[PDB]
Amino acid sequence: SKFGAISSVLNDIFSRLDPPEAEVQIDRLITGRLQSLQTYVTQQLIRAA
């Protein structure tokens, strides 16, 4: 999932974009992936209960 980023691949984003907007795109991707992992852990805690 792109999470609204121009792509889901980190290397391509670091490749075709300059730091000023590359940092924002990577921040979007990291926020999305951290949210997905947090959802996974929350669901795992519920199933562990």
């Binding site: 730091p19 000023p20 940092e23």
Partner: protein, 48 residues
């Protein structure tokens, strides 16, 4: 504001070439003459 330290740089370049004076930019000036750090904080000033 109040600043812990201050440094001022100066130079002469073209008009449209001032576009290259920004953090993390790429170009002749940005890469081979004068490069700002990606986390630079301050102001860039130019005039005719």
């Amino acid at each position: 504001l109040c600043f812990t330290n201050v440094y001022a740089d100066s130079f002469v370049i073209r008009g449209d070439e001032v576009r290259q004076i920004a953090p993390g930019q790429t170009g002749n000036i940005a890469d081979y003459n004068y490069k700002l750090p990606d986390d630079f904080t301050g102001c860039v000033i130019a005039w005719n």
